Amino acid sequence: SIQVIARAASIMRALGSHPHGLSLAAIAQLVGLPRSTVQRIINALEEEFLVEALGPAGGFRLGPALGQLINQAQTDILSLVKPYLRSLAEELDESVSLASLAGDKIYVLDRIVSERELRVVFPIGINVPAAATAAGKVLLAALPDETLQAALGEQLPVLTSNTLGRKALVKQLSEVRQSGVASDLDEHIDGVSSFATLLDTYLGYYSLAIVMPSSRASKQSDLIKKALLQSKLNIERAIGR
Amino acid sequence: QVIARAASIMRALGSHPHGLSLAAIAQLVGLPRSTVQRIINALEEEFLVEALGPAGGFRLGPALGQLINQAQTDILSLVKPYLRSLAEELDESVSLASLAGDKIYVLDRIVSERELRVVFPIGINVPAAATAAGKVLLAALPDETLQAALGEQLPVLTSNTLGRKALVKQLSEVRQSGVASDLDEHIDGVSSFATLLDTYLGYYSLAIVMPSSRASKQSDLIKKALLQSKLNIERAIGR
Amino acid sequence: QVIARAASIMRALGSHPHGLSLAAIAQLVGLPRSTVQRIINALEEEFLVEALGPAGGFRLGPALGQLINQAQTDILSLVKPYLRSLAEELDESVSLASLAGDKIYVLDRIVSERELRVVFPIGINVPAAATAAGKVLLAALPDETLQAALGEQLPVLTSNTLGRKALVKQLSEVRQSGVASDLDEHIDGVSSFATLLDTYLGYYSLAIVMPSSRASKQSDLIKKALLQSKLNIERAIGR
Amino acid sequence: SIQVIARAASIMRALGSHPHGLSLAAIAQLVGLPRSTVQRIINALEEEFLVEALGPAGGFRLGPALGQLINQAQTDILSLVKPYLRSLAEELDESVSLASLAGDKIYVLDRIVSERELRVVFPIGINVPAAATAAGKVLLAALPDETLQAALGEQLPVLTSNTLGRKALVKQLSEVRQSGVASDLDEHIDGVSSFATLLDTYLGYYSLAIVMPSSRASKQSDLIKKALLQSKLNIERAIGR
């Protein structure tokens, strides 16, 4: 095809994996290219505000233009998904969250809270180790096996007495990776269990999750996972790739 | 330098989330349908773009998400506190938003403890032309692009919602005064005061949303607290 | 007919929750310290009264609760729906309150869905002289008792909070117009419209609490919906 | 002492037990007095608005004056207790409710909801069978054993697969009745457990309860019951009889 656009893209990819910044060196190493031609391409991107330089520190990181490319698109997928959330939420009378992956942590883009007396409540915009959530697992699975080992940077945090370890985690990732859905049982907050499925949108990967008290979970896991799959099918039908 | 052609194309696609015909792309950017086709193909190979079927339409692609996500989820995570702070200094609701065409999008928000309060949900839309936040963002728009959001004739939400004329005129004012406001232009009884955030990742709006009742009195202190917060936030996250 | 003496004593005690000296009780009611002592003793035998130690003070007792509780918890349970209904007809917050001296007490409340909303918690106090609810209740007060709540000189919550004079004058008006209102007399920017509920268990206040912003326009329809609700509720729970 | 005031009082007592109304007959039977002298006393009370007649139906029920006697006092106890609630709530980071008995159902006068993710949420002003709640048990215990058999009108409702039956219920009432506190484990809402203690105020009996997910309850019952007792001691010190 065209090799230089692909070089550029590989560089962007590299920068998006390291939000704090990269040295021209480190960029050059990650991508399979010489510090020189890299410098060239960076410059090209910088001319377009797709990248910025963190001072004479010779560091680089993503730039302004990015926002304006993505914003509308994103604000639309969300706006389109919102209803599909409420629906699900009211079919199951359980809280549901829509999240995206940001390295080792997922990020909650949206959420509907259950009316129930025994309820699970969290705020939009919250972080939480991907390794401990159903959503996090569902996203981690879809990760290219090369990239995966980035999020699984050596050893995992442990949030409860059930939080998986790298081994059982990967092993299970293999399972979700073709079973379609994932779950967590008191692996994040003791007494809470979640059930998530992947959303493959044209804009990237999202996680659709049900978050509920384990108390009530043990009984209806069956119906939960199903409603999730139905919602995945719908949503993707309307917004997939 | 073909990189710049590509970039111009991406820019074009981000302005039209529903999709563009190879033709329309070719026209918007100053390039021939052919070389454009070429570049599209190049991007498509990278999932930076997708084709809406034999419809010959194109729109943004998967890779995008994975580029932006972390960065974004960080700016937000970093700004969140700066919101609470402001919120508690003024005891008024505050929202952080971004522009999506003619509508702003609320990324985050803190609601006032107060008895007479203004309450809205995260993830809400609202015509940019009617909000302080929307004005602050619209101002920063390149004057070429501006006329996109200001497509033809504005909606009118109240008996005060500005019209294209007074709107642009005022945009010129905010565009160097630094901040913007709206007085019962969105919801009657509500007034807002916003300022621009120029982050390395793009433009955001930091806004105070409050009952006009309480606004008429303290506009002065509001605008100031906003500017102080802009200075802080940008000091820590600017470009 | 000694039953009436007793009752007068209870009445006296309910007006002074902190307690009364046998003396003060004797003076308030038109009876001699002696026969009063007698009756107190009789009531005390029934736990309708208690003695605040050798301090010779007296105040209400345990049995009271068990007499009232069920009845009360029923009126409330019966009124709750009538609240929601009203709330959704007007899309404005509504409160059900009772009088406790100079302050009203919010027994229940439904909060408006709206963006510009008024929010308060159940169980809150607020000077009766400043609320529509408070006025509606104060009106129904026997003119003798009234001068108890209107002890000397009123608090002033805003730059509109009435003064004893205009207050009484207006009480005369509500006292046969049926309903009362307050315009930024409690919290600036908030206005309320209340009506009396004459239940078999006592007097309640049914009120709409809303932003003045939105009030100036629809006072008319508010007062009407209130009256309709009063008529219904009383039809089902009046005396 | 004085016998007629006591006759009257007995009548009031009778009426407060039957909020819907009593026939002069039924009143006469409940209290140990003749239909005649009862009629007399009723009349005396009616002159004072302590009672009303439900029409020629010859029925009677409580009256207006009542409210004005109790209101202030009540609105004060509540106002005084409110803080003691928040305090407790924040010491345990669990929801707490203040309730009173209304026959077979308790009535929630006030409540503070936990900040927590797995939380229990209910509205003020709610009813719920006393036989199924810790609060309800605590109040039922304090009931005179004669009166008790009113609330325990034959057979109980059953809210869960754990809701006690009249037998185990009474048996347990004997226990709380000198242990001081009561509890319910998934007897009201499956997954929810509560721990309550009695408040003996000068104005009557109240229930102070902690309501939490059983999940989190099994672990800290111990500390809960203690904080409850401490709060009872405080509150009563300030508002007891």
| Closest to D63 measured CA to CA, from D42, D83, D84, D79 | D42
DSSP string, B49-73: EEE-GGG-EEEE-SHHHHHHHHHHH
Q: By three-state DSSP, how is residue D208 classified?
A: strand
Please report, for residues C90, C223, D203, the alpha-carbon distance to residue C207 in angstroms, rounded to integers and kept in the order given.
12, 10, 28
C73 touches chain D (CB under 8 A): yes
CA atoms within 13 A on the CB side of A109: 26
CB A14, CB A28: distance < 8 Å: no
Contacting subunits of C (3+ beta carbon pairs below 8 A): B, D
Judge: D69–C122 Cβ closer than 8 Å, yes or no: no
C224 touches chain D (CB under 8 A): no
Tell me the nearest-neighbour CA distance from B220 into chain A, angstroms: 31
Picking from A124, A202, A239 by the largest number of B CB atoms within 10 A of its own CB, the best residue to mutate is A202
- Residue D200 β-bridge partners: D205
Rama region for B58: left / alpha / beta (φ>0; ψ in -120 to 50; rest) = beta
- The beta strands (E) that lie in chain C are given as 20-21, 49-51, 57-60, 93-100, 103-110, 116-118, 125-127, 179-183, 190-199, 202-211
- Rounded to whole angstroms, the Cα distance separating B183 from B161 reads 9
Residues of chain D with CATH 1.10.10.10: 1-64
Rama region for A154: left / alpha / beta (φ>0; ψ in -120 to 50; rest) = left
CB B57, CB B20: distance < 8 Å: yes
- Rounded to whole angstroms, the Cα distance separating B156 from B177 reads 25
Chain centroid offset of residue C22 CA: 27
Please report, for residues A85, A202, A237, B125, B203, the alpha-carbon distance to residue A79 in angstroms, rounded to integers and kept in the order given.
10, 15, 16, 9, 20
Q: By three-state DSSP, how is residue C115 classified?
A: coil
Residues of chain C with CATH 3.30.450.40: 63-239
Could you say which residues from 137 to 176 on chain A have a Cβ atom under 8 Å away from some Cβ of chain B? none
- Rounded to whole angstroms, the Cα distance separating A132 from A111 reads 18
Judge: A44–B1 Cβ closer than 8 Å, yes or no: yes
Tell me the nearest-neighbour CA distance from A219 into chain B, angstroms: 32
Q: By three-state DSSP, how is residue C209 classified?
A: strand
A44 touches chain B (CB under 8 A): yes
Contacting subunits of B (3+ beta carbon pairs below 8 A): A, C
Contacting subunits of D (3+ beta carbon pairs below 8 A): A, C
Residue of D nearest to A122 (CA): D117
CA dihedral A207, A209, A211, A217 (to 10 degrees): -140
Could you say which residues from 190 to 209 on chain C have a Cβ atom under 8 Å away from some Cβ of chain D? 199-203
Could you say which residues from 78 to 107 on chain D have a Cβ atom under 8 Å away from some Cβ of chain A? none
DSSP string, chain A: --HHHHHHHHHHHHHHT-TT-EEHHHHHHHTTS-HHHHHHHHHHHHTTTSEEE-GGG-EEEE-SHHHHHHHHHHHHHHHHHHHHHHHHHHHHTSEEEEEEEETTEEEEEEEE---SSEEE---TT-EEEGGGSHHHHHHHHHS-HHHHHHHT-SSPP--SSS---HHHHHHHHHHHHHH-EEEEESSSSTTEEEEEEEEEETTEEEEEEEEEEHHHHHHHHHHHHHHHHHHHHHHHHHHB-
Residue of B nearest to A79 (CA): B123
CB D24, CB D60: distance < 8 Å: yes
Give the experimental resolution in Å: 2.9
Residue of A nearest to D122 (CA): A117
Considering only CB atoms, which chain A residues are within 8 Å of D121? 116-117, 119
| Closest to D159 measured CA to CA, from D112, D181, D127, D117 | D127
In chain B, which residues are followed by a C-to-N distance beyond 2.5 Å, i.e. a gap? none
Size of interface A-B (CB pairs under 8 A): 183
C134 touches chain B (CB under 8 A): no
Task: Return all residues near B124 (Cβ < 8 A) that are at least 6 apart.
Answer: B105, B106
Chains A and B make contact, 3+ CB pairs within 8 Å: yes
Tokens standing for residue B238: 């600017």
Neighbours of B148 (CB within 10 A): 13
Helix H or strand E encompassing C88: helix C63-90
Judge: B7–A41 Cβ closer than 8 Å, yes or no: no
Q: Which residue has the tokens 């209806």?
A: A220
Size of interface C-D (CB pairs under 8 A): 183
Helix H or strand E encompassing C167: helix C164-177
Q: By three-state DSSP, how is residue D219 classified?
A: helix
Q: Which amino acid is at C55?
A: A
CATH class of B1-62: mainly alpha
D126 touches chain A (CB under 8 A): no
- Rounded to whole angstroms, the Cα distance separating D211 from B74 reads 37
Picking from D212, D215, D218, D220 by the largest number of A CB atoms within 10 A of its own CB, the best residue to mutate is D215
| Closest to D48 measured CA to CA, from C8, A176, B3, B224 | C8
Query: How would you class B90 by CB atoms within 10 Å of its CB: exposed for 0-12, middle for 13-18, buried for 19 or more?
Result: buried
- Rounded to whole angstroms, the Cα distance separating D21 from D37 reads 19
- Rounded to whole angstroms, the Cα distance separating A62 from A13 reads 10
Q: By three-state DSSP, how is residue B179 classified?
A: strand
Selecting from A74, A76, A202 the residue whose C-beta is nearest the C-beta of B62 gives A202
CATH class of D65-241: alpha beta
Phi, then psi, of B114 in degrees rounded to 5: -55, 160
Judge: A117–D189 Cβ closer than 8 Å, yes or no: yes
- Rounded to whole angstroms, the Cα distance separating B4 from A184 reads 45
Judge: A73–B14 Cβ closer than 8 Å, yes or no: yes
Judge: B116–C190 Cβ closer than 8 Å, yes or no: yes
Selecting from A122, A189, A215 the residue whose C-beta is nearest the C-beta of D191 gives A215
CA atoms within 13 A on the CB side of C48: 26
CB A20, CB B237: distance < 8 Å: no
CATH class of A1-64: mainly alpha
Selecting from B50, B80, B201 the residue whose C-beta is nearest the C-beta of A67 gives B201
Q: Which amino acid is at C128?
A: A
Tell me the nearest-neighbour CA distance from B211 into chain C, angstroms: 7
Residue of A nearest to B41 (CA): A1
Instruction: Convert D147-188 into a string of H (helix), E (strand) and C (coil).
Output: HHHHHCCCCCCCCCCCCCCHHHHHHHHHHHHHHCEEEEECCC
C116 touches chain B (CB under 8 A): yes
Judge: A117–D117 Cβ closer than 8 Å, yes or no: no
Phi, then psi, of C50 in degrees rounded to 5: -135, 155
Tell me the nearest-neighbour CA distance from D101 into chain C, angstroms: 7
- Rounded to whole angstroms, the Cα distance separating C38 from C31 reads 11
What is the largest distance, in Å, between two alpha-carbon atoms of chain A?
A: 62
Give the Cα-Cα-Cα angle C26, C30, C36 (nearest 5 degrees). Answer: 40
Picking from C13, C18, C73 by the largest number of D CB atoms within 10 A of its own CB, the best residue to mutate is C73
CB C141, CB D68: distance < 8 Å: no
Tokens standing for residue B152: 């033809």
- Rounded to whole angstroms, the Cα distance separating C34 from C23 reads 10
Selecting from A116, A192, A214 the residue whose C-beta is nearest the C-beta of D117 gives A192
Chain centroid offset of residue A72 CA: 19
Q: Beginning with the edge strand found earlier in the chain, give each strand of the sheet holding C179-183 in spatial order.
A: C125-127, C103-110, C93-100, C202-211, C190-199, C179-183
Q: Tell me which architecture the domain covering B63-239 has in CATH.
A: 2-Layer Sandwich (3.30)
Selecting from B115, B120, B213 the residue whose C-beta is nearest the C-beta of C212 gives B213
CB B70, CB A222: distance < 8 Å: no
CA dihedral C33, C36, C37, C40 (to 10 degrees): -150
Residues of chain C with CATH 1.10.10.10: 1-62
Rama region for D111: left / alpha / beta (φ>0; ψ in -120 to 50; rest) = beta
Please report, for residues A18, C82, D41, D115, the alpha-carbon distance to residue D89 in angstroms, rounded to integers and kept in the order given.
43, 32, 47, 10
Strands D59-62 and D51-53: antiparallel
Enter the DSSP assignment of C122: T
Helix H or strand E encompassing C43: helix C33-44
Enter the DSSP assignment of B193: E
C11 touches chain D (CB under 8 A): yes
Enter the DSSP assignment of B102: T
Tokens standing for residue B166: 């007074």
Q: By three-state DSSP, how is residue C114 classified?
A: coil
Tell me the nearest-neighbour CA distance from B213 into chain C, angstroms: 5
C218 touches chain B (CB under 8 A): no
| Closest to D194 measured CA to CA, from D224, D162, D152 | D224
CB D162, CB D183: distance < 8 Å: no
- Rounded to whole angstroms, the Cα distance separating C36 from D181 reads 40
- Rounded to whole angstroms, the Cα distance separating D49 from C202 reads 10
Selecting from B10, B69, B239 the residue whose C-beta is nearest the C-beta of A100 gives B69
Selecting from B7, B41, B201 the residue whose C-beta is nearest the C-beta of A48 gives B7
- Rounded to whole angstroms, the Cα distance separating C235 from C228 reads 11
D229 touches chain C (CB under 8 A): no
CB D33, CB D7: distance < 8 Å: yes
Judge: D73–C64 Cβ closer than 8 Å, yes or no: yes
Report helix angle A35-46 to B2-14, nearest 10: 40
Tell me the nearest-neighbour CA distance from D94 into chain A, angstroms: 12
Judge: C71–D107 Cβ closer than 8 Å, yes or no: no
Judge: B189–C118 Cβ closer than 8 Å, yes or no: no
Method underlying the structure:
X-ray
